Target: 3-PHOSPHOINOSITIDE-DEPENDENT protein kinase 1
Amino acid sequence: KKRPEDFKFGKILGEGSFSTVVLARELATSREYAIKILEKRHIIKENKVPYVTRERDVMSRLDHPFFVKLYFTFQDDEKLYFGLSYAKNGELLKYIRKIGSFDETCTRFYTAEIVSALEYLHGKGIIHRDLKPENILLNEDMHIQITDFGTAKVLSPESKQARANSFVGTAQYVSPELLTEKSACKSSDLWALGCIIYQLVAGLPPFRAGNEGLIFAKIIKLEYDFPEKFFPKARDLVEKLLVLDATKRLGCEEMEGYGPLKAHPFFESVTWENLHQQTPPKL
Ligand SMILES: Nc1ncnc2c1ncn2[C@@H]1O[C@H](COP(=O)(O)OP(=O)(O)OP(=O)(O)O)[C@@H](O)[C@H]1O
Ligand SMILES: [Cl-]
Ligand SMILES: [Cl-]
Ligand SMILES: [Cl-]
Ligand SMILES: [Cl-]
Ligand SMILES: [Cl-]
Ligand SMILES: [Cl-]
Ligand SMILES: [Cl-]
Ligand SMILES: [Cl-]
Model:
């Protein structure tokens, strides 16, 4: 097991409400990692332990180019340390804010990468549940690196589990079924995907309000609209994802999965097989 003294720590990359991510260089190899550090006392005191165990368990199952990788974990008297891959280019949200609206090529490319990632994730029977641009990081090559798995759920193949009961997520991206049926499924991530596509083109996510309760009320009534100049094929895709009935979302198991989603006309130009080796278009 690695130890804290095996690293030179640098700048804080981010601060969560129960964790801090710090850039670190491993002394023996000179490799750079993003180390998520948690204080045991705090975690135990504020019962966030379940989030911690869940994050480690889920990330340990993932081996795919479009996800942040957990290389190692270790601990000392007071803290837990997650050694994570370093996404040098930070979060996608930063680019949306700075650019305002992605062109069609960039929207399609990044959507395709997220679709690819979700296909892998859902194929392992895992629901992310907090898919959002803040949780989609970009590596030094500008490919996506999806992160934040403390709120993810590994569904049980043994009981053919399709629904999860924990109330987690971010209001803007929360699916209607979580609000009304108090449960989430793989399809809830497809809802979030629709929200993200809309946001890439529109600049803001579809269900907008100053507070959570107002957002919740709009989500359950599907109260949103498209701005002018919304790319037609993207609009068609968004409308097939932002559907109240979770069994009717393009991409979901009841709609026969990822084949039909990847076949949507929006992705007509996409070569799915080697996305992660393609040079992403310039934002
Ligand atoms: N692997 C990584 N590479 C680069 N930056 C990262 C990485 N993981 C997290 N970050 C940065 O750290 C910030 C917050 O990190 P962290 O996951 O500790 O908290 P959070 O999940 O955002 O908040 P909370 O603890 O409330 O869930 C993010 O905004 C992100 O920019
Ligand atoms: Cl430290
Ligand atoms: Cl450093
Ligand atoms: Cl590395
Ligand atoms: Cl590991
Ligand atoms: Cl919520
Ligand atoms: Cl509409
Ligand atoms: Cl169309
Ligand atoms: Cl593929």
Remarks:
- Residues 224-225 surround chloride ion (ligand 7) (CB under 6 Å).
- The domain at 1-90 is CATH 3.30.200.20 (Phosphorylase Kinase; domain 1).
